[PDB]
């Protein structure tokens, strides 16, 4: 067989430098183990300084941080502040008492 | 011999600012006495024909090589002498002798400039230096360290690469054939040539003759050739010849423009030990870029 | 910090010079101020690495393999060259400063004749000499060295390098000068010296060779040039060879008691 | 700020073995010291001594002076090494396995 | 003093990092400071740090943050591999080239304000770069200079209107050109990021001069050969580049016409061969990246 | 940022089941393959031939294969050996 699975082979991005352990397997383990959804908070409003509270009336932003049947996340989920965690549960109770989400 | 006989170098009188009277005697005049004697000792057509001749005809023969050793570091030295006029710098035997203490001092090669060739008028010379080494910084940086990097004896030289890798009716108009794509530094070590027309190849040629003499040794012992002979010596004359090829075809050859002689012989004397570097500073501050711009080729505007 | 040795007799060697060989002048260029060079450069190259530690013929032997330390190696060869061409050539290796002794009359011993004799065909050593002065002169156009070496084969050999060419390790001999154009014989030693090198199994690219140099000739322009002359290289190595000390040479040729 | 200005000055290993800190004789006025490589800390102390002396009175005119005698010096030494390599290849020297061919060895 | 040494000491030169030693994402250049041992410290343990390094660590490079931490041992990774990167980069002798021609940033160049004509596009940069700012320390960038530059409004209510006169009874197109020109002429007397913090030029990877040719015994080297190896079997998704591994760096490897079937047969262990490459040119980008363009030589 | 959680000073640091990686058995895989082949093809079909001969070799002396990677895991003796280093208790 000439294919393998993408999750046993390591796509090296162009211009970076690597060493011949990013050839083996405990690099892809490693990446495994350390793979964590650290870029959110560049694309996560609710982590940059707005107020969770002024987005009661966006329910596209607030949908974002509810579960597929609207269960809020907990805030190990989330990973905000815990004031942010505190608006954005209140943006979120709010908006589900206007009719929007 | 005057055959190898420069105007601005007058024995008895020295080159003021880079070599004394001395300096210039051992340098020059008792230098091109000897290796003119070995030339005429071991070719008798020495007189006959001219240095670049017997150095592109006894080429890539060893038999001939003591003939082009001498013949080629007569022209290397001739080359390297023709473009210094001096400098209004202190007389090389009036200063004192760098000890020690120069090895740790800073060079400045990349702050100031000195000596360009603008300044002279040579200003086609000077836009070919920037296009092809971006800064008159650049090129002075690039080529003093160069030299200063060769241990023993050899040149450093500013080239000019021929834009006439056709090798159709190559050498039949001076100036269709005189044209020059880009210039380049390169280094010669002991009696090496700068053109590399006449040497380029003599390893692969070497290569393949004793892969062929080994490989009908082998018919006779009789054996099925290798699993990775035929492989390894395949690669080593891939590489070979993808190493030497020029941008179209496989003649690359170069136009000597100026040469910085780097032997001991010529800067050992003034200088000492410890001021090779001061050699070379005062070497820049001493060439006549009139004779550089001259010897460069028209641009090949193929662009 | 690498420092330049102290030579025994120094305050002769800085008034007198080497005698038969050498003036004060010639003496001070090539050791007080050349080895100051080597040094001075080498310690700047290695400083703040573990090759400090190391004396320079270790270095250049842990560095011979290494492409891009070639400037280090160059600088540990000639330092280690250096000192044992100003070794066999110095007068006494004693320090006879306070006993002032003025008669050293140092003869090849009878191992050396005798290794002399199995090694050139019963060729004498003044017949050796005229040999070694004539592949000095035809194998080195520029700066080098000319060693007479002893192999693992108790045969001594003549050995010449380019530059900073080290005798002990082959690879590094730098005896061809692949400037000019070079006979297929040359180009056979040369193609046989990489396939050693690739029998090798060690992942430095490594070979064994135990030669070991026995007499030093410096062929360096810092070594003749004032006092003899562009030109007049085989009157100095002429010279260097008739004057030779052979206490230190004798005690190079290993013995066995 | 030197080693956010250049990330590949930290590729040059160092050595935090210390030999003998009392016997560090440097004379500033340069840059290049007997006994210890030309490095970062090269770069620094070259900037102290300026702005001790008075030559530069801000900081950062006396370290941009610093960093160009840093380039040149690191620039002579470029080319020593491309050259003794190229020189040594020009008479005969062979090297079993180089730094490309170690890395596609691993 | 005491204080006087520590500064100069081995580890005062080691500039303080507490990046993770264990980065999974793009690595572009060096992140920690690689530390040598010699042999004979090595065989003792030392290494110049607080603490002994275990003794099953073999290597003689390693790479750390902190000297010692609450669950007392030495944070480092034994591993020194970055300057086998720099090294092989040096042994392929491809100079880095500016793909925008700029001066060269190794060599005190007289510049002049040709680029200077774009004062109103950074002097606002300096509240405008705030790409990663906090919000409300971003917003302290609004009060704090606020004041500061209405503390000149006397100093441009008097040369304006002694200088520029007919602008201040006419338009303002050409005030706004006075104020831009205004600050900035009294800001480059102040030190706002007098300290620029991004990579110059190369960043220290090479400081070869590109220039000079390669002599050989088979004459001048004209394209430079370097084994590598093919990442992926199909071309970049999006990009008509393939992929390459060369000397520790990752390579956009043009094909001269086609690419060779020794793709299509081996597949996704493309990798596990070695090829020769010729490299084009290299670049350095912003990010502190190398952009390495190479050549698939076959054996033709 | 990110929530650290220290625990307090316990009797021991013990994982009551430590995790290990069990090998498949090379003969049941194949015994797995060529029933899935007969399920497909049919039994005794000739396309499972070479899967009949390798489950025969894989089975020959022991229906299992020579089974040798038993391993048992470390943790619990690392753990209690480093426990005491790295807990980051204060002194007494």
């Known amino acids: ?101 | 011999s005057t055959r190898y006989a420069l105007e601005h170098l007058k024995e008895g009188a020295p080159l003021k600012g880079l070599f004394s009277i001395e300096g210039l005697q051992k340098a020059w005049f008792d230098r091109v006495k000897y290796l003119d004697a070995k030339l005429n000792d071991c070719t008798n057509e020495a007189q006959q024909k001219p240095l670049e001749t017997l150095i592109h005809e006894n080429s890539k023969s060893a038999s001939k090589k003591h003939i082009v050793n001498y013949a080629s570091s007569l022209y290397n030295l001739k080359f390297s002498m023709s473009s210094l006029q001096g400098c209004i710098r202190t007389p090389p035997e009036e200063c004192p002798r760098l000890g020690p203490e120069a090895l740790l001092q800073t060079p400045d090669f990349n702050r100031t400039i000195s000596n360009e060739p603008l300044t002279t008028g040579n200003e086609r010379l000077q836009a070919a230096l920037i296009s092809s080494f971006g800064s008159l910084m650049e090129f002075r940086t690039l080529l003093i360290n160069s030299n200063l990097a060769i241990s023993g004896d050899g040149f450093t030289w500013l080239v000019a690469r021929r834009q006439l890798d056709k090798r159709a009716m190559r050498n039949d108009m001076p100036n269709r054939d005189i044209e020059y794509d880009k210039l380049f530094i390169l280094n010669t070590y002991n009696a090496g040539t700068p053109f590399n027309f006449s040497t380029s190849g003599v390893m692969n040629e070497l290569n393949n003759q004793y892969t062929n003499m080994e490989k009908q040794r082998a018919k006779e012992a009789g054996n099925l050739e290798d699993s990775e002979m035929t492989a390894k010596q395949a690669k080593t004359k891939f590489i070979y010849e993808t190493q030497q090829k020029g941008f179209s075809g496989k003649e690359v050859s170069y136009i000597p423009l100026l040469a910085i002689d780097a032997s001991p012989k010529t800067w050992l004397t003034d200088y000492g030990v410890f001021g090779k570097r001061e050699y070379l500073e005062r070497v820049w501050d001493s060439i006549e870029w009139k004779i550089v711009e001259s010897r460069l080729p028209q641009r090949t505007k193929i662009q | ?257 | 700020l030197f080693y956010k200005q250049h990330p590949w000055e930290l590729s040059r290993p160092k050595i935090l073995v210390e030999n003998e800190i009392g016997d560090e004789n440097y004379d500033w006025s340069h840059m290049l010291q007997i006994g210890r490589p030309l490095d970062g800390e090269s770069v620094i102390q070259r900037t102290m001594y300026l702005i001790k002396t008075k030559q530069y009175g801000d900081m950062v005119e006396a370290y941009d002076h610093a960093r160009y005698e840093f380039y040149a010096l690191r620039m002579q030494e470029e080319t020593e090494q491309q050259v003794a390599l190229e020189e040594a290849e020009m008479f005969g020297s062979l090297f079993g396995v180089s730094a490309i061919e170690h890395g596609i060895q691993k | 003093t005491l204080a006087e040494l520590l500064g100069r000491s081995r580890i005062a030169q080691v500039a303080n990092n507490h990046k993770p030693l264990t980065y999974t994402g793009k690595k572009f250049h060096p992140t920690h400071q690689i530390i040598e041992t010699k042999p004979s410290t090595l065989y003792r343990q030392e290494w110049g740090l607080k603490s002994a390094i275990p003794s099953k660590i073999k290597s003689r490079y390693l790479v750390y943050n902190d000297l010692d931490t609450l669950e007392r041992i030495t944070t480092f990774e034994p591993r020194g591999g970055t300057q086998w990167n720099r090294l092989r980069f040096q042994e392929m002798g491809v100079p880095i080239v500016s793909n925008i021609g700029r001066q060269n940033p190794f060599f005190k160049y007289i510049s002049r304000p040709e680029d200077e004509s774009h004062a109103k596009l950074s002097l606002f940069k300096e509240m405008k770069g705030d790409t990663d700012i906090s919000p409300a320390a971003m917003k302290k960038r609004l009060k704090k200079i606020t004041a500061l530059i209405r503390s000149f409004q006397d100093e441009f209510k008097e040369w304006l209107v002694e200088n520029h006169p007919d602008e201040l009874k006419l338009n303002s197109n050409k005030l706004e050109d006075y104020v831009v020109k205004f600050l900035n002429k009294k800001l480059e007397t102040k030190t706002n990021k007098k300290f620029n913090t991004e990579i110059i030029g190369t960043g220290g990877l090479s400081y070869s001069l590109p220039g000079k040719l390669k002599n050989s015994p088979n004459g001048v080297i004209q394209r430079t050969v370097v084994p590598g190896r093919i990442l992926n079997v199909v071309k970049e998704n999006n990009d008509n580049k393939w992929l390459a591994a060369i000397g520790g760096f990752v390579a956009d490897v043009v094909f001269f016409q086609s690419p060779p079937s020794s793709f299509n047969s081996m597949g996704d262990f493309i990798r596990m061969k070695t090829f020769l490459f010729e490299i084009l040119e290299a670049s350095m980008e912003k990010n502190g990246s190398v952009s390495m363009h190479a050549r698939l030589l076959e054996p033709q | 940022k990110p929530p650290v959680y220290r625990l307090p000073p316990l009797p021991r640091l013990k994982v009551k089941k430590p995790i290990i990686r069990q090998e498949a058995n090379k003969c049941l895989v194949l015994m797995s393959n060529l029933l899935q082949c007969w399920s497909s093809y049919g039994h005794m079909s000739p396309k499972c031939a070479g899967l009949v001969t390798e489950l025969k070799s894989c089975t020959s002396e022991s229906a299992l294969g020579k089974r040798n990677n038993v391993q048992k895991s470390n943790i619990n003796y690392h753990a209690a050996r480093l426990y005491d280093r790295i807990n980051g208790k204060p002194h007494d």
């Open chain 1, 1 to 101: 067989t000439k294919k393998i699975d993408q999750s046993l082979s390591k796509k090296l991005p162009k211009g970076t430098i690597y060493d011949p352990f990013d050839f083996s397997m405990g690099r892809i383990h490693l990446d495994r183990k350390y793979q964590a959804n650290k870029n959110s908070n560049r694309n996560d409003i609710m982590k940059s300084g707005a107020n969770p509270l002024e987005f009661y009336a966006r329910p596209r932003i607030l949908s974002r941080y509810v579960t597929s049947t609207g269960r809020i996340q907990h805030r190990d989920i989330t990973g905000l502040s815990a004031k942010n965690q505190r608006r954005l549960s209140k943006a979120i109770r709010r908006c589900q008492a206007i009719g929007l989400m």
């Open chain 3, 1 to 257: 910090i690498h420092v330049v040795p102290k030579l025994p007799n120094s305050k002769a060697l800085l008034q007198n010079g080497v005698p038969n060989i050498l003036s004060s002048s010639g003496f001070k260029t090539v050791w007080f101020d050349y080895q100051r060079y080597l040094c001075d450069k080498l310690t700047l190259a290695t400083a703040g690495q573990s090759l400090e530690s190391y004396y320079p013929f270790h270095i250049l032997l842990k560095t011979a393999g290494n492409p891009l330390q070639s400037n280090i190696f160059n600088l540990a060869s000639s330092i280690h060259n250096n000192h044992l061409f100003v070794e066999n050539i110095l007068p006494s290796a004693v320090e006879h400063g306070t006993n002032s002794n003025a008669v050293v009359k140092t003869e090849p011993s009878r191992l050396f004749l005798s290794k002399i004799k199995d090694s050139f065909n019963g060729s004498d050593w003044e017949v050796v000499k005229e040999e070694m002065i004539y592949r000095a002169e035809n194998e080195v156009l520029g700066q080098g060295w000319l060693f007479l070496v002893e192999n693992n084969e108790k045969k001594l050999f003549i050995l010449t390098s380019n530059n900073n060419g080290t005798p002990y390790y082959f690879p590094r001999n730098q005896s061809f000068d692949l400037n000019s154009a070079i006979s297929i014989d040359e180009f056979a030693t040369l193609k046989q010296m990489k396939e050693l090198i690739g029998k090798s199994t060690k992942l430095n690219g490594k070979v064994q060779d135990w030669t070991m140099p026995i007499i030093c000739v410096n062929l360096w322009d810092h070594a003749y040039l004032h006092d003899y002359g562009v030109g007049n290289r085989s009157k100095y190595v002429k010279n260097v060879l008739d004057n030779l000390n052979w206490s230190v040479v004798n005690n190079r040729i290993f013995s066995g008691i």
